[PDB]
Amino acid sequence: SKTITLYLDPASLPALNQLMDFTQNNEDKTHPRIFGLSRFKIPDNIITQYQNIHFVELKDNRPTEALFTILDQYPGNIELNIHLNIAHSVQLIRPILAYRFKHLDRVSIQQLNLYDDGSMEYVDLEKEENKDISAEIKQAEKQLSHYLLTGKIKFDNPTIARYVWQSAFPVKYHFLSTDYFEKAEFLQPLKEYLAENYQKMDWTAYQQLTPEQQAFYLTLVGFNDEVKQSLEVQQAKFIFTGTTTWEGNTEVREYYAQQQLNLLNHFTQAEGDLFIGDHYKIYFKGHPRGGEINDYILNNAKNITNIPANISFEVLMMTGLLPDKVGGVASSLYFSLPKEKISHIIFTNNPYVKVMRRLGIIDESQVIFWDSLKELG
């Protein structure tokens, strides 16, 4: 049989890891590959070097039936090597299971590689604090069994169902935070259940690539020379991190733009509650989905250097280009940021807060929210 590798991710963290996997394997120019990465366009110069390389759109967190046409090109026995986003794993593998169903003799699942979406997994697990995890796991395994057998999705506990793929396939999980699993006492039954099927995301993998593969990887994530250089200057550096909002509105986006500009000034103005001192060069790392929110900071702020919003913050870590201090709105990027580089984390009782306090990312101090900082200026 042939092995076909599928890389599916609507978000960004998993994509970063999958792109690394691609890079690590990039010597093989003919291994069938199917990219379903909503946030990363593989440039055409790289595309033209590979054969049997395919692309599928995602819609509603699942590949479209365009996937069937790709797969039909491989008439032999095929084994599926699948990389997914943990939070949306159930939906992302739905059409693959559907296709498998129409082709039992030829199509089988080799294994699954699951990666965290971000803070979302943790916030959702935090909400199961009061439940009997052990009982929840068994229900999940049983319901997953029904899905695999009927194609129908029905989970009493959709959060816990994300973690029971062991019962069906060889799987490896890559967690943003292993600590959460090891330290949260109510999750001890999930931890033991997972046994040897998980590991921490290895942010040092980049260091082990050859220099040409590094240049290659940088092209996939879009970390160009111009950005690299401004982060190599020899001066004290602070990066303000932006956030965004789902709420496809305007009054909310606008409000978020205003508050985030205010939060910036609390960091950068002498009268601010968060004032960092006047010995740092200021940088802005807007949120990749910030849109107008990011424009708003660049249009109204003063002596600040922009790090193109599309570049995922974790790329700076991999390339060793982390600044001295990082501050801004609570974000998935703070789960992997070295502790001594945290200036201050602000939020917009609260499970996101509970998660970060449990992980020690924030202390017992007293959470600062958006709306408690006065309008400076």
Ligand X SMILES: Nc1ccn([C@@H]2O[C@H](COP(=O)(O)O)[C@@H](O)[C@H]2O)c(=O)n1
- Annotated binding-site residues read 242, 285, 287, 312-314, 331-332
Tell whether residue 285 is a contact of ligand X (CB under 6 A). yes
Shortest distance in whole angstroms from residue 12 CB to ligand X: 5
- Round to the nearest angstrom and report the end-to-end CA distance of the chain: 67
Q: Which residue type does 369 have?
A: F
CB of 165 to ligand X, least distance (A): 23
Write the interaction track for ligand X spanning residues 113-132; mark x where CB under 6 A is met and - where it is not: -----xx-------------
Q: Which is nearer to ligand X, 61 or 166 (CB)?
A: 61
| Binding of ligand X by 241 (CB under 6 A) | yes
Sequence-distant (6+) residues with CB within 8 A of 310 are: 222, 288
Q: How far is the CB of 242 from ligand X (least distance, A)?
A: 4
Residue 293 is a binding residue for ligand X (CB under 6 A): no
Q: Of the listed pieces 47-55, 79-87, 123-131, 310-318, which binds ligand X according to CB under 6 A? A: 310-318
Q: Considering the complex, what minimum distance in angstroms separates the CB of residue 93 from ligand X? A: 22
> According to the binding rule CB under 6 A, does residue 12 interact with ligand X?
yes
* DSSP conformation class of 343: E
State the Cα–Cα distance between residues 353 and 364, nearest whole angstrom. 10
Residue 243 sits in the site that holds ligand X (CB under 6 A): yes
Q: Which stretch binds ligand X (CB under 6 A): 1-9, 149-157, 230-238, 286-294?
A: 286-294
Give the interface size with ligand X as a residue count (CB under 6 A): 17
- Cβ neighbors of 190 (< 8 A, separation 6 or more) are 133, 137, 160, 163, 181
Backbone angles phi, psi at 45, to 5 degrees: -55, -35
**If binding is defined by CB under 6 A, does position 333 make contact with ligand X?**
yes
Q: How far apart are CA 230 and CA 294, in angstroms?
A: 19
Quote the CA–CA distance of 172 and 76 in Å, as a whole number: 26
Beta strands in 234-341 (DSSP E): 237-241, 281-285, 304-307, 325-329
Strand intervals (E) in 259-339: 281-285, 304-307, 325-329
Q: Is residue 276 at the binding interface for ligand X, with CB under 6 A as the rule?
A: no
CA distance 100 to 108: 7
Q: Residue 331, interface with ligand X (CB under 6 A)?
A: yes
Tokens of 277: 């001192």
Residue 287 lies near ligand X (rule: CB under 6 A): yes
Choose the binding region for ligand X from 68-76, 91-99, 180-188, 283-291 (rule: CB under 6 A).
Answer: 283-291
Interacting residues toward ligand X by CB under 6 A: 12-13, 118-119, 241-243, 285-288, 312-314, 331-333
